[PDB]
Amino acid sequence: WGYGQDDGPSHWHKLYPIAQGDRQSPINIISSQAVYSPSLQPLELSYEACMSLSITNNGHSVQVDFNDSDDRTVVTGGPLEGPYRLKQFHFHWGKKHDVGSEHTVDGKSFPSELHLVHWNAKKYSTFGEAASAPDGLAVVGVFLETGDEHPSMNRLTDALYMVRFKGTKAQFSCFNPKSLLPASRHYWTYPGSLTTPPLSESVTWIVLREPISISERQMGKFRSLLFTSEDDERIHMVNNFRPPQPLKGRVVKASFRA
Numbered sequence: 001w002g003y004g005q006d007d008g009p010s011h012w013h014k015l016y017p018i019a020q021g022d023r024q025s026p027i028n029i030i031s032s033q034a035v036y037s038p039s040l041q042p043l044e045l046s047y048e049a050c051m052s053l054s055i056t057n058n059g060h061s062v063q064v065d066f067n068d069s070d071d072r073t074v075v076t077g078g079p080l081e082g083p084y085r086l087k088q089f090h091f092h093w094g095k096k097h098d099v100g101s102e103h104t105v106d107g108k109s110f111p112s113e114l115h116l117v118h119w120n121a122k123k124y125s126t127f128g129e130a131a132s133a134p135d136g137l138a139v140v141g142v143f144l145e146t147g148d149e150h151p152s153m154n155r156l157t158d159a160l161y162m163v164r165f166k167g168t169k170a171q172f173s174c175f176n177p178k179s180l181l182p183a184s185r186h187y188w189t190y191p192g193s194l195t196t197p198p199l200s201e202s203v204t205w206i207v208l209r210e211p212i213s214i215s216e217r218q219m220g221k222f223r224s225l226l227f228t229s230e231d232d233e234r235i236h237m238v239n240n241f242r243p244p245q246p247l248k249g250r251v252v253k254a255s256f257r258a
């Protein structure tokens with residue numbers, strides 16, 4: 001599977017039937033239809049500064065992995081019952097600036113979307129095990145728009161050249177993911193799935209209301225990454241996103257009033 005013309009999202013169901021399931025992600029969030037839920041707890045992203053390990057081009061995205069041996073870097077509150085440890089973060093983006101994000105809001109897409117992936121380590125033994133359970137994962141999504149240069153983002157975009165080819169990785173120490181967060185903690189939440197195969201319906205999605213901004217130069221660095229290996233013909237990593245899926249009666253809750 002991939003994001004090309006022949007192995008892209010519209011064909012994933014041929015391999016993973018759950019692709020046509022009842023709690024698939026991403027979705028188009030219709031703001032006026034989300035339900036204000038004042039019973040939700042405050043969302044807290046408690047991240048340490050030096051828990052990052054490496055940055056890798058896995059052929060589908062660029063991902064930063066974290067040390068998750070303890071609960072020093074976790075998300076808690078909001079719709080979650082307990083803390084979920086951060087395992088990794090990655091991005092989805094487009095070839096053009098009018099597309100790239102997985103989730104959309106009122107039919108609007110952003111050029112990119114950041115996914116901070118957490119798991120219920122207090123309850124499950126491995127990330128893979130948690131990924132098989134309805135309450136196993138929590139992914140915080142942050143939209144990216146282009147505008148002013150993002151200072152912290154420079155560390156990440158400067159490291160992309162060395163991982164331009166599929167299957168390569170580099171050490172990436174002391175990058176605090178809190179630096180990629182907006183000043184607001186308002187969000188939308190709904191029960192969903194992983195947005196890439198195996199498409200398991202084990203994710204509690206937390207999509208932040210406020211996007212962060214990066215420069216066009218920085219966004220351009222992501223488009224310089226490749227889906228291909230060093231020997232293969234070059235194919236730039238772009239449009240690595242899954243389009244919105246049917247809501248199927250699910251209720252989207254909001255921590256705020258629109």
Ligand SMILES: Cc1ccc(CN2CCS(=O)(=O)N(CCc3ccc(S(N)(=O)=O)cc3)C2)cc1
Pocket residue numbers: 058060061115117127128131139193194195196197198
């Ligand atoms: C590029 C890639 C490599 C390996 C796999 C295999 N996969 C098996 C089940 S797992 O152990 O739970 N894990 C899923 C990884 C994941 C996918 C999507 C999202 S997302 N976009 O919904 O935030 C968050 C996290 C690895 C899939 C994709």
Ligand SMILES: [Zn+2]
Pocket residue numbers: 090091092115195
């Ligand atoms: Zn993702």
